[PDB]
Amino acid sequence: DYCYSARIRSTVLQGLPFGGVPTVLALDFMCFLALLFLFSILRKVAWNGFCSWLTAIFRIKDDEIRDKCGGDAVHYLSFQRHIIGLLVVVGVLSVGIVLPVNFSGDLLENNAYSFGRTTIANLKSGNNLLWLHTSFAFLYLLLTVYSMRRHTSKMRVKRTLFINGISKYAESEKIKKHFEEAYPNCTVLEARPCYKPLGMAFVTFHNETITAIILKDFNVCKCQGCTCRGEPRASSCSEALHISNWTVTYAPDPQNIYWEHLSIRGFIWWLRCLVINVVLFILLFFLTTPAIIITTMDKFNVTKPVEYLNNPIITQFFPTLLLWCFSALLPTIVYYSAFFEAHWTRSGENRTTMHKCYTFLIFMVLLLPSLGLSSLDLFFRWLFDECVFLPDNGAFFVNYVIASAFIGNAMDLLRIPGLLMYEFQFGAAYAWMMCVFTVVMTYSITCPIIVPFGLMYMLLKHLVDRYNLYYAYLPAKLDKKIHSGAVNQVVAAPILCLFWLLFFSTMRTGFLAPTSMFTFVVLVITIVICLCHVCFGHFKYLSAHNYK
Numbered sequence: 085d086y087c088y089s090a091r092i093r094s095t096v097l098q099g100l101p102f103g104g105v106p107t108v109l110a111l112d113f114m115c116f117l118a119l120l121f122l123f124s125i126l127r128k129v130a131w132n133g134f135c136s137w138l139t140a141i142f143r144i145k146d147d148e149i150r151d152k153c154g155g156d157a158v159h160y161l162s163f164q165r166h167i168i169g170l171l172v173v174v175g176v177l178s179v180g181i182v183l184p185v186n187f188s189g190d191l192l193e194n195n196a197y198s199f200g201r202t203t204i205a206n207l208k209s210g211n212n213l214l215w216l217h218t219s220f221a222f223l224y225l226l227l228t229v230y231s232m233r234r235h236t237s238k239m240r241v242k243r244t245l246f247i248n249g250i251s252k253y254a255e256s257e258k259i260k261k262h263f264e265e266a267y268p269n270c271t272v273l274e275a276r277p278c279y280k281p282l283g284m285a286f287v288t289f290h291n292e293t294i295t296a297i298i299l300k301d302f303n304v305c306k307c308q309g310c311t312c313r314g315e316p317r318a319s320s321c322s323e324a325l326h327i328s329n330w331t332v333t334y335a336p337d338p339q340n341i342y343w344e345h346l347s348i349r350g351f352i353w354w355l356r357c358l359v360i361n362v363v364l365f366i367l368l369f370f371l372t373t374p375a376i377i378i379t380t381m382d383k384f385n386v387t388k389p390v391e392y393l394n395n396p397i398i399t400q401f402f403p404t405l406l407l408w409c410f411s412a413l414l415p416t417i418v419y420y421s422a423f424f425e426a427h428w429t430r431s432g433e434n435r436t437t438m439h440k441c442y443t444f445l446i447f448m449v450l451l452l453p454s455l456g457l458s459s460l461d462l463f464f465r466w467l468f469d470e471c472v473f474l475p476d477n478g479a480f481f482v483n484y485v486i487a488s489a490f491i492g493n494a495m496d497l498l499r500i501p502g503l504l505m506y507e508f509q510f511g512a513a514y515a516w517m518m519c520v521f522t523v524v525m526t527y528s529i530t531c532p533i534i535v536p537f538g539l540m541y542m543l544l545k546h547l548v549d550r551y552n553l554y555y556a557y558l559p560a561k562l563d564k565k566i567h568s569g570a571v572n573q574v575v576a577a578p579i580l581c582l583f584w585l586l587f588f589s590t591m592r593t594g595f596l597a598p599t600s601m602f603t604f605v606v607l608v609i610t611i612v613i614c615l616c617h618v619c620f621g622h623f624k625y626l627s628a629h630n631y632k
């Protein structure tokens with residue numbers, strides 16, 4: 085009883101020794117080591133001793149970080165410090181309690197060196213123990229929440245609106261009298277157009293709930309047979325106003341405002357947005373696909389015996405190193421290109437780009453490679469001329485995590501030196517570390533052995549951060565709304581762990597098989613709760629964001 089019966093048909097599909105992890109690891113370490121020597125001769129070029137910086141890493145006290153950098157660096161390092169701790173608990177459960185279950189699988193017991201043995205693919209469908217995987221996936225959601233209730237637990241104008249689309253010939257009298265007659269419950273303190281004003285204004289009220297009500301009445305989605313939104317109500321003042329044509333917003337400070345960009349609104353602005361974002365999403369397909377093609381040479385006609393796999397130098401190391409190169413350049417595209425979308429507020433742009441870096445990195449590292457590698461008609465050709473799971477059984481992901489761990493972090497030292505010719509980007513750095521955490525979490529239950537490398541991705545990213553925050557990057561104060569943003573991404577990670585579990589369950593047993601059902605039930609219950617935080621606002625004691 086086996087899956088491949090390698091004695092009958094010596095089929096190329098049965099993968100490398102150890103998934104090619106040993107060669108990837110050996111070359112990645114050796115490339116890391118070489119980069120640390122290269123770093124040393126770089127930082128010594130400009131003016132205590134060769135490796136002195138490596139001693140500094142473990143000497144600097146947390147209070148020195150706190151004192152020099154300010155609170156944003158400590159809130160950042162707290163986030164890391166929690167995720168490191170999170171991954172020890174998830175790590176010990178994965179390697180301790182998931183892996184010995186997987187490895188008890190009867191399905192890949194031939195092919196003893198196959199990395200596939202340490203994955204869900206080793207478990208025969210209908211085997212009772214498959215509930216343990218669904219259970220841990222849920223348990224990990226509770227831990228990624230509880231660990232973020234702890235992170236957030238440790239950490240620390242409101243009547244003024246900015247009103248846009250006023251005609252340049254408008255008058256403060258009419259603008260003032262409008263609110264106090266269209267909404268007689270209000271009272272107006274100030275009402276001023278702003279920098280021949282170009283049709284933007286500040287207005288200030290007496291009361292905050294009234295402010296929110298007035299702010300809603302220009303923007304709110306509620307409907308009739310006539311119109312899909314609450315159209316802003318008429319007045320005697322209206323000729324100065326052009327009320328229907330406004331956009332109205334809580335006023336940020338003028339240091340946040342792009343007085344250039346907000347000159348365009350409605351369908352035109354959504355055109356510039358969609359044709360920038362489509363070009364980038366098209367481009368991801370071509371950046372992605374070389375990695376998947378170079379990896380997938382399990383074709384036939386000739387070159388069919390197991391002996392015909394290439395060296396894991398080309399079939400594992402090279403493609404994951406190329407995918408890393410594109411992963412590490414991707415932030416530099418979206419930070420550059422987001423300038424041309426013309427957001428209204430620098431704060432928005434910063435807060436947008438962190439979620440855009442993250443979701444493009446997710447499409448091009450996790451989701452499109454997951455669909456690409458899952459698109460193995462390969463099994464259909466073997467079968468016609470369950471044991472379906474990724475080619476190499478997902479060793480590709482381990483190999484990515486290793487590549488990003490050793491080569492990525494060693495490169496992170498070198499990201500700030502220079503002189504080879506003869507300021508902390510908090511959003512980018514958040515996006516990048518949650519991209520990697522997402523992969524680890526996604527595979528942590530289908531493919532346990534990824535988690536140790538996930539942990540050491542974090543430890544080395546942490547040390548290199550604690551180092552380069554204190555010594556290298558300029559001390560920076562930041563907009564708090566990105567730290568709170570990043571915690572939502574951490575909650576996405578175990579949810580995508582549940583989704584791919586439902587996928588690789590439902591492509592290996594029916595949707596009516598009870599583990600498929602249970603995973604669906606958990607997922608649908610989880611998502612309605614998570615959505616009810618976003619605007620509906622019912623749950624605000626739960627899931628995250630305990631604050632001082």
Ligand SMILES: CC(C)CCC[C@@H](C)[C@H]1CC[C@H]2[C@@H]3CC=C4C[C@@H](OC(=O)CCC(=O)O)CC[C@]4(C)[C@H]3CC[C@]12C
Pocket residue numbers: 365432435436439440443
């Ligand atoms: C296969 C392809 C062609 C379609 C797959 C869908 C994605 C391209 C979509 C689905 C959800 C979208 C995201 C949903 C929400 C946001 C948040 C948005 O930023 C916000 O914070 C909005 C609210 C605010 O700024 O206050 C920026 C765009 C982004 C990342 C979107 C980018 C495009 C995404 C990933």
Ligand SMILES: CC(C)CCC[C@@H](C)[C@H]1CC[C@H]2[C@@H]3CC=C4C[C@@H](OC(=O)CCC(=O)O)CC[C@]4(C)[C@H]3CC[C@]12C
Pocket residue numbers: 439442443446451565568569570572573576580583
């Ligand atoms: C193959 C299956 C999984 C379908 C593909 C689904 C994706 C399009 C989803 C999965 C997870 C989603 C992300 C999970 C979490 C967030 C956080 C969310 O954050 C906020 O809106 C923060 C707002 C604030 O903090 O003020 C922005 C969208 C984003 C990136 C989502 C974008 C759409 C993603 C990539």
Ligand SMILES: CC(C)CCC[C@@H](C)[C@H]1CC[C@H]2[C@@H]3CC=C4C[C@@H](OC(=O)CCC(=O)O)CC[C@]4(C)[C@H]3CC[C@]12C
Pocket residue numbers: 572573575576579608611614615617618619
């Ligand atoms: C039929 C329906 C139920 C299918 C749902 C498919 C997608 C639309 C789902 C799958 C995963 C979801 C995400 C999973 C996790 C999160 C984190 C969490 O993010 C926030 O709270 C950000 C917004 C805020 O700051 O208030 C809640 C929304 C979000 C992005 C979800 C948005 C909707 C997503 C993309």
